[PDB]
């Protein structure tokens, strides 16, 4: 595989997201770290699929709503950022006010 440090680091994000994903499935209101990991992982898969940066900046605001997260959580996340390999290389996706 020849995994570089950055690829191994992202495995940590992916795994953190598996945790949140299961908790949401049980119907729990997600906390701060769970919310960030869940939305971040979503974006990385979007880049893998070949979606554009512009599309993801929008789609990322519709992953979790205010009623699926704990109180105060939406305000603790004014934005979310993550980079991934798009067909045209690494790019940064910034999602402003992801939880509404």
């Amino acid at each position: 595989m020849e995994l570089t440090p950055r690829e191994k680091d992202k495995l940590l994000l992916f795994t953190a997201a598996l945790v949140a994903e299961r908790r949401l499935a049980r119907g729990l209101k997600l906390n701060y770290p769970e919310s960030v990991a869940l939305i971040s992982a979503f974006i990385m898969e979007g880049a893998r699929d070949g979606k554009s940066v512009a599309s993801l900046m929008e789609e990322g605001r519709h992953v979790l709503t205010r009623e699926q997260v704990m109180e105060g959580v939406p305000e603790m996340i004014p934005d979310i950022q993550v980079e991934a390999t798009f067909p045209d290389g690494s790019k940064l996706v910034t999602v402003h006010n992801p939880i509404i």
Binding site: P5, L13, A16, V19, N31, P33, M70, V82
Partner: protein
């Protein structure tokens, strides 16, 4: 010109009169003072103020600070104020107004070409915490503690050995020398405690001369009146502190006998409530004395729904007790008492207990000293309302009383307050930057000796430091020689004189302890109450002046599930 207060706060952080909520608790602080000159605040960035000829001067390095923390909201035992902080030579230079004297008024902290900038507008800055109850079971504890905001760790141990699992003791010259050398590799200030349980003074003197800054008296090694007296005699002659974990079994006598053996000499009582150890069931009465500096370990802070259930088994493992041996289990219900556990929280709120500590991996959580201290303050506000000392509609006094518990008081108790423990000029620059929403839980920046040692860091390959995953990673202040230069290894005056540092070839900066015998309960900042406290031998009820002291167990706590992944 003019600017609205709201827009002003969004730009430079809150000012006089503005209140800020501490994390998700019910504690609110209010800015008591602002040292700036409105319209002359220094701000860094493109087209901002800190630029040549403007907010940055023409002075040489010797005439300006190395690091400036701009627009910081300081929360310390002495005040909650807005100001710039200057750091020079790894020490706190000034708390005032930074800028360029050439064009700005009231500049007390000069910024020049040699000045680095940390933007603290909107953040709370505090001194680094000090945990004086560390069991050196593993080296990984230092990183865990540093990430939580604790910059100094005092304790004893040699690693995962039975003696260390149970007690804070680094036994003898060889192990002390070995741990002093190992300490250079750790990013926190460190001081070791030796085994004080012996009735032959020379065996203690050797340990002090070898480098320990204190002696731990522990019942597992025999906390007898003879051993206690011996340790205190040597402590009195070498100016080192004694930490006590008394005779829970009442084998050599009761609490009054131990107190008698102490004989009015200065001593730090560990986990004074008793669950962590001490005369059953009244070791808590020790906080009534002037020569006793009392502290709590963290698993009992604060009293919650699961506290009791959890403790019964934790006790066994720590002290190598057998659940099958009746005598080893009978003293469980004698050591774990809802009555004293509930009272402890109140005694902290009143200032009867002056310190908080961990008791790392031996009935304590190394990364939760700061976190739990604030949870107690929250629960006490909720249950008891404002303190008699409060002024105004804020919790400022309660905040100063509690922050002192893990900062200045531990420093005073162990004779290291001349070096660390608070944000005062001349002290080592061990600072912690917090975003208000994560105060006491997850730090934005941890500064050691003037260099950032650890901080949250995003994707290393990213175009900015903010992209996920963001987790705590070691910085330059935690690297090799830069680390040595930014940390302190505390030595006893005798060890320092004997040339222990040169002989062991220690690489870090050296500090010496002093003033351990002269400190008393009255010297503990905002926590000097000596209550007329009693414990009922049968019911275990705690009473102060005859009134019952108690509290209710929390079902939910702030700084808990909203912040942690697990």
């Amino acid at each position: 010109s003019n600017i609205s207060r709201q827009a002003y706060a969004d730009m430079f952080g809150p000012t006089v009169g503005d209140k800020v909520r501490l994390a998700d608790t019910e504690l609110w602080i209010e800015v008591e003072d602002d040292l700036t000159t409105y319209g002359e605040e220094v701000k860094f960035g493109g087209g901002k103020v800190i630029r040549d000829g403007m907010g940055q001067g023409q002075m040489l390095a010797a005439d300006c600070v190395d690091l400036v923390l701009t627009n910081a909201l300081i929360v310390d035992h002495w005040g909650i104020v807005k100001a710039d902080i200057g750091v020079k030579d790894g020490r706190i230079f000034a708390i005032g107004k930074a800028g360029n004297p050439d064009i700005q008024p009231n500049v007390t902290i000069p910024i020049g070409a040699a000045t680095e900038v940390i933007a603290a507008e909107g953040k709370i800055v505090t001194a680094g915490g000090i945990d004086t109850h560390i069991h050196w079971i593993c080296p990984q504890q230092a990183e865990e503690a540093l990430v939580s905001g604790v910059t100094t760790m005092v304790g004893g141990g040699t690693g995962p050995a039975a003696g260390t699992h149970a007690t804070t003791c680094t036994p003898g010259p060889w192990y002390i020398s070995r741990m002093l050398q190992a300490a250079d590799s750790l990013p926190v200030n460190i001081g070791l405690l030796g085994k004080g349980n012996v009735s032959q003074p020379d065996a203690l003197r050797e340990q002090v001369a070898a480098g320990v800054i204190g002696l731990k008296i522990h019942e597992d090694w025999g906390a007898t009146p003879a051993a206690i007296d011996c340790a205190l005699t040597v402590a009195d002659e070498m100016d080192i502190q004694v930490a006590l974990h008394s005779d829970t079994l009442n084998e050599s006598g009761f609490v009054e006998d131990t107190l008698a053996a102490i004989g009015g000499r200065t001593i730090h009582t560990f986990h004074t409530e008793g669950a962590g150890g001490g005369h059953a069931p009244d070791i808590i009465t020790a906080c009534a004395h002037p020569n006793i500096l009392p502290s709590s370990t963290n698993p009992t802070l604060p009293y919650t729904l699961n506290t009791i259930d959890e403790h019964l088994d934790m006790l066994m493992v720590c002290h190598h007790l057998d659940p099958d041996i009746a005598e080893d289990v009978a003293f469980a219900e004698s050591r774990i008492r809802r009555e004293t556990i509930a009272a402890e929280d109140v005694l902290h709120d009143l200032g009867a207990f002056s310190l908080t500590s961990s008791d790392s991996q031996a009935m304590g959580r190394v990364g939760e000293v700061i976190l739990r201290t604030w949870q107690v303050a929250h629960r006490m506000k909720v249950q008891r309302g404002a303190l008699a000392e409060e002024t105004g509609d804020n919790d400022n006094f309660r905040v100063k009383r509690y922050i002192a518990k893990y900062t200045i008081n531990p420093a005073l108790t162990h004779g290291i307050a001349h070096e660390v423990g608070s944000i005062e000029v001349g002290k080592l620059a061990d600072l912690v930057v917090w975003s208000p929403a994560f105060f006491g839980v997850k730090p934005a920046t941890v500064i050691k000796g003037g260099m950032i040692a650890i901080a949250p860091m995003g994707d290393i390959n990213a175009s900015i430091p903010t992209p996920q995953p963001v987790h705590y990673r070691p910085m330059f202040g935690a690297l090799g020689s830069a680390r040595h230069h930014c940390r302190l290894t505390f030595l006893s005056q005798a060890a320092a004189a004997n040339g222990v540092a040169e002989r062991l070839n220690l690489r870090s900066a050296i500090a010496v302890v002093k003033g351990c015998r002269t400190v008393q309960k009255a010297d503990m900042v905002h926590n000097s109450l000596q209550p007329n406290i009693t414990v009922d031998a049968q019911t275990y009820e705690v009473r102060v002046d005859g009134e019952l002291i108690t509290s209710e167990p929390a079902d939910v706590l702030p700084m808990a599930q909203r912040y942690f992944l697990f």
